[PDB]
Design an enzyme around this catalytic site. Sequence first.
Site, PDB file in Angstrom:
ATOM      1  N   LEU A   2       0.798  -1.217   0.000  1.00  0.00           N
ATOM      2  CA  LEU A   2       0.000   0.000   0.000  1.00  0.00           C
ATOM      3  C   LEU A   2       0.837   1.277   0.000  1.00  0.00           C
ATOM      4  O   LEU A   2       0.359   2.334  -0.398  1.00  0.00           O
ATOM      5  CB  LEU A   2      -0.985  -0.006   1.170  1.00  0.00           C
TER       6      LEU A   2
ATOM      7  N   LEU B 127       5.350   2.663   0.086  1.00  0.00           N
ATOM      8  CA  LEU B 127       6.757   2.478   0.387  1.00  0.00           C
ATOM      9  C   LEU B 127       7.277   3.594   1.263  1.00  0.00           C
ATOM     10  O   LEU B 127       6.956   4.758   1.063  1.00  0.00           O
ATOM     11  CB  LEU B 127       7.569   2.475  -0.886  1.00  0.00           C
TER      12      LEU B 127
ATOM     13  N   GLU C 126      -5.935   2.350  10.033  1.00  0.00           N
ATOM     14  CA  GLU C 126      -7.037   2.310   9.135  1.00  0.00           C
ATOM     15  C   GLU C 126      -6.528   2.407   7.710  1.00  0.00           C
ATOM     16  O   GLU C 126      -5.385   2.787   7.468  1.00  0.00           O
ATOM     17  CB  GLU C 126      -8.018   3.422   9.458  1.00  0.00           C
ATOM     18  N   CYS C 127      -7.394   2.049   6.771  1.00  0.00           N
ATOM     19  CA  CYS C 127      -6.973   1.740   5.437  1.00  0.00           C
ATOM     20  C   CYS C 127      -7.559   2.754   4.486  1.00  0.00           C
ATOM     21  O   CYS C 127      -8.766   2.895   4.412  1.00  0.00           O
ATOM     22  CB  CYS C 127      -7.470   0.354   5.113  1.00  0.00           C
ATOM     23  N   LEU C 128      -6.731   3.473   3.754  1.00  0.00           N
ATOM     24  CA  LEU C 128      -7.279   4.564   2.991  1.00  0.00           C
ATOM     25  C   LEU C 128      -7.338   4.253   1.506  1.00  0.00           C
ATOM     26  O   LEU C 128      -6.388   4.593   0.777  1.00  0.00           O
ATOM     27  CB  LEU C 128      -6.487   5.837   3.281  1.00  0.00           C
TER      28      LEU C 128
ATOM     29  N   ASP D 122       6.483  16.182   7.590  1.00  0.00           N
ATOM     30  CA  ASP D 122       6.599  15.475   6.319  1.00  0.00           C
ATOM     31  C   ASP D 122       5.224  15.493   5.662  1.00  0.00           C
ATOM     32  O   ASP D 122       4.736  14.488   5.174  1.00  0.00           O
ATOM     33  CB  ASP D 122       7.108  14.062   6.559  1.00  0.00           C
TER      34      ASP D 122
END
Length: 295
Positions: free
Chosen positions: A27, A29, A96-98, A143
């Site tokens: 998902l 790097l 959580e997964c975006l 960042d």
Amino acid sequence: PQFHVKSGLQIKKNAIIDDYKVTSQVLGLGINGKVLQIFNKRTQEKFALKMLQDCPKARREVELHWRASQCPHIVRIVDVYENLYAGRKCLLIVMECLDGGELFSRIQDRGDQAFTEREASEIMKSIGEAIQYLHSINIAHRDVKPENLLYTSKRPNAILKLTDFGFAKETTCYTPYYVAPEVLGPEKYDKSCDMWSLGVIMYILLCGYPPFYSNHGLAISPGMKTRIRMGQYEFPNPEWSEVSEEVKMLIRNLLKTEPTQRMTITEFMNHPWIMQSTKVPQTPLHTSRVLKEDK
Ligand SMILES: O=C1NCCc2[nH]c(-c3ccnc(-c4cnc5ccccc5c4)c3)cc21
């Protein structure tokens, strides 16, 4: 009664695979390599898993990120394991997964609508909340780039979230009403770079290219690098020809070379263009089309 206390961070020690299915799908790097997709065995929902080697620097990232997960616009950490991996102690962060992928991919994948000024204001608003949350708890994120702004889904009501705490950093009586902030301790120009980032992301949102573009050769990437130092960028037409002088001025104030000159997150959120997300002109921007020009 009425005591809002959320819970503390709990490093789970059982093997994560006891609790989740772990895929080879990548998902993202980073410096710590891959972000993997995983599935919660019980719930069967999808999560992103970030893996760090355990150590003081890793621990801080986790801690800051946990601290910040309470913010609606910051990727939520859902739990954290410390396991053994090749005889090496590790932190496995389950967030959580975006699915909506990165901020720019989404804009650039319209091309059949048009991306309005107001849509951009709303965007910048929600990034702002994230920074605001952060700074008010004395964390600089440091960042805040395109790559780390992702969407919860593809659904157009997706909410936009900040990820990646690998470079976040802490910034840290009874006659106090009148004491100047500078007397309340050190904290030297540190959250101000988050402010610069914000200017850059705003620039790009409004037109589709960075204010400081490369060129390659000489005085074109060594020069691109002094271009930043001098603070030299234009609002070239015919992208900017139709853009509110008020907005230009806002970018100008974020992209201030000297950090102490630059705007605060607080000043930012009180700015009309950001505060009146709602009533900003519906005006058509080039962004999406210009983005389509690349590799
Ligand atoms: O902290 C990080 N460092 C390196 C880049 C990164 N991506 C993530 C991340 C976090 C949560 N979700 C994703 C993600 C999930 N699903 C995706 C689907 C399609 C494209 C990108 C996706 C990213 C990435 C975290 C980090």
